[PDB]
Amino acid sequence: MKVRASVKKLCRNCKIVKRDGVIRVICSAEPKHKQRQG
Amino acid sequence: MLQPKRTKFRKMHKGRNRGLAQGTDVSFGSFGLKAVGRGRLTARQIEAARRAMTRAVKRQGKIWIRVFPDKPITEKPLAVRMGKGKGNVEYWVALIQPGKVLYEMDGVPEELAREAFKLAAAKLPIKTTFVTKTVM
C-alpha cells in the first residue's frame, strides 16, 4: 500500500475508488499500484 | 540561474506586489504557462521549471522565458541581530502577478506542451494555467 497525499492511476488497470471516505487506487494488474490517500 | 548582468544598485526595497500582470498574452510562441497566482519566482525556480520543460520536449520547438528575475532579495544570516544594515543579496526574483505569461513554447504539439508545462508548473510556487496564442 502506497499511502500518499497524491493518489493516481499508475496504469490502465488502476481504478480510483472511494471507500469509507478514503480515495484508493486498486489495481487488478499490479499490487504495487494500490494506493491510499493519507 | 538568471540574474541581471549589472544592476544600478545592489539592494532594493521590498516593495509590494499589488496589481495584475502586463505580459499577459502569448506573444512569441503558440502556448504559454500563465500565472494565475501572485508571488515571486526565484531564479532557481525559473531554472528548475525551464529544465523540466526543455527535457520534456526533448530539445524540440522553442521556449521563451517571459519573466526575468531582476529583484535582489536580501537575507540576514543566522544569529544576526535585527539592525546594522540591510542584509546581503542572496537570490533574485521576478515578481509575478496574476496573468503573467511566464513561459512560452512553440514548435511542439499542444498535448506535448501541456505535459511540459505541467512538469514546469510542478516546479513553481504559484498556481499556473495553460494558455494558447490568441488571435487578437
Binding site: - | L20, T24, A35, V36, P98, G99, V135, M136
Partner: protein, 94 residues
C-alpha cells in the same frame, strides 16, 4: 455571419461594468464610421463561444441592438488577465 444580440446600456463606469460581468454579461463599444459610439452589453458566454473562432476576428459581425442590425468588426478585445473570460470588445463599424 456571426450574429450578436446586444443591449444599449445606461449604466457606465467601473461599478456598472463589474456589475455586468458579475451577471455573466460584459460591456462592449461600437465606434467608427460617422455615428456616435454606442455602449452595449453582451452576453458573455455566447460571445465567448463565438470568438473562439478565428472568423470572429476576421469576418464582419452583426450586432443587433434594439432589433437593429449593425455591421461591425471586432477590432480590440480586453480579456481577463488569467481567466478565460472577456472584459470588453471594441467593435468598429464595418
Amino acid at each position: 455571419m456571426f450574429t450578436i444580440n446586444a443591449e444599449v446600456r445606461k449604466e457606465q463606469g467601473k461599478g456598472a461594468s463589474r456589475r455586468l460581468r458579475a451577471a455573466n454579461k460584459f460591456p462592449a463599444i461600437i465606434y467608427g464610421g460617422k455615428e456616435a459610439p454606442l455602449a452595449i452589453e453582451l452576453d458573455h458566454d455566447k460571445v465567448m463561444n463565438m470568438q473562439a473562432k478565428a472568423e470572429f476576428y476576421s469576418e464582419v459581425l452583426t450586432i443587433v441592438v434594439d432589433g437593429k442590425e449593425i455591421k461591425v468588426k471586432a477590432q480590440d478585445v480586453q480579456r481577463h488577465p488569467y481567466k478565460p473570460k472577456l472584459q470588453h470588445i471594441d467593435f468598429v463599424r464595418a
